[PDB]
Amino acid sequence: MSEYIRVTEDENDEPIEIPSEDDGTVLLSTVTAQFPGACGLRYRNPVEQCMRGVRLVEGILHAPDAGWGNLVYVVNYPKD
Amino acid sequence: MSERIRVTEDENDEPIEIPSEDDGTVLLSTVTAQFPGACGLRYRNPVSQCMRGVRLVEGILHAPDAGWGNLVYVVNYPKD
């Protein structure tokens, strides 16, 4: 089954739901669809309450230990 | 023609329709053929009350297992 994630570009608005691949990874192109100019992904680990960045390779974001559907994610946005 | 997909950018006007492919895929060019530069698609997800986007890969949109009929609503628009 395809993993499911909930990202957010701006916390003042509503979060965005992203359908991931069955592989358990997320495709950056799906992010760029809703987020133009943006790339990358962040989240916070409930372990140390610190912000973290999701691993990316060739446009493919790699899920954490438990996967995607457990925490919230934030899309990396530049100043532009 | 194979499947058609309803989609709009603003609910004040009338939603348009784009021919999707039998493989559950839509071509970016077909979307931009309708919209003046729009990319990606999403909709009001009643499940999370957020905006759920659709899988995108190199300009090719990939429908979920259900298909396009459950996501036919709003098209995405980049800043460029």
UniProtKB/Swiss-Prot annotation, chains A, B:
Record's subcellular location: Nucleus; Cytoplasm; Cytoplasm, Stress granule; Mitochondrion
PTM comment text: Hyperphosphorylated in hippocampus, neocortex, and spinal cord from individuals affected with ALS and FTLDU. Phosphorylated upon cellular stress.
Function of the protein: RNA-binding protein that is involved in various steps of RNA biogenesis and processing. Preferentially binds, via its two RNA recognition motifs RRM1 and RRM2, to GU-repeats on RNA molecules predominantly localized within long introns and in the 3'UTR of mRNAs. In turn, regulates the splicing of many non-coding and protein-coding RNAs including proteins involved in neuronal survival, as well as mRNAs that encode proteins relevant for neurodegenerative diseases. Plays a role in maintaining mitochondrial homeostasis by regulating the processing of mitochondrial transcripts.
Pathological condition linked to this protein in its record: Amyotrophic lateral sclerosis 10: A neurodegenerative disorder affecting upper motor neurons in the brain and lower motor neurons in the brain stem and spinal cord, resulting in fatal paralysis. Sensory abnormalities are absent. The pathologic hallmarks of the disease include pallor of the corticospinal tract due to loss of motor neurons, presence of ubiquitin-positive inclusions within surviving motor neurons, and deposition of pathologic aggregates. The etiology of amyotrophic lateral sclerosis is likely to be multifactorial, involving both genetic and environmental factors.
Quaternary assembly: Homodimer. Homooligomer (via its N-terminal domain). Interacts with BRDT. Binds specifically to pyrimidine-rich motifs of TAR DNA and to single stranded TG repeated sequences. Binds to RNA, specifically to UG repeated sequences with a minimum of six contiguous repeats. Interacts with ATXN2; the interaction is RNA-dependent. Interacts with MATR3. Interacts with UBQLN2. Interacts with HNRNPA2B1. Interacts with ZNF106. Interacts with CNOT7/CAF1. Interacts with CRY2.
Domain comment (free text): Consists of an N-terminal domain (NTD) and two tandem RNA recognition motifs, RRM1 and RRM2, followed by a C-terminal glycine-rich region.
Protein name as catalogued: TAR DNA-binding protein 43
Record lineage: Eukaryota, Metazoa, Chordata, Craniata, Vertebrata
Full-sequence portion shown in this chain: 1 to 80 of 414
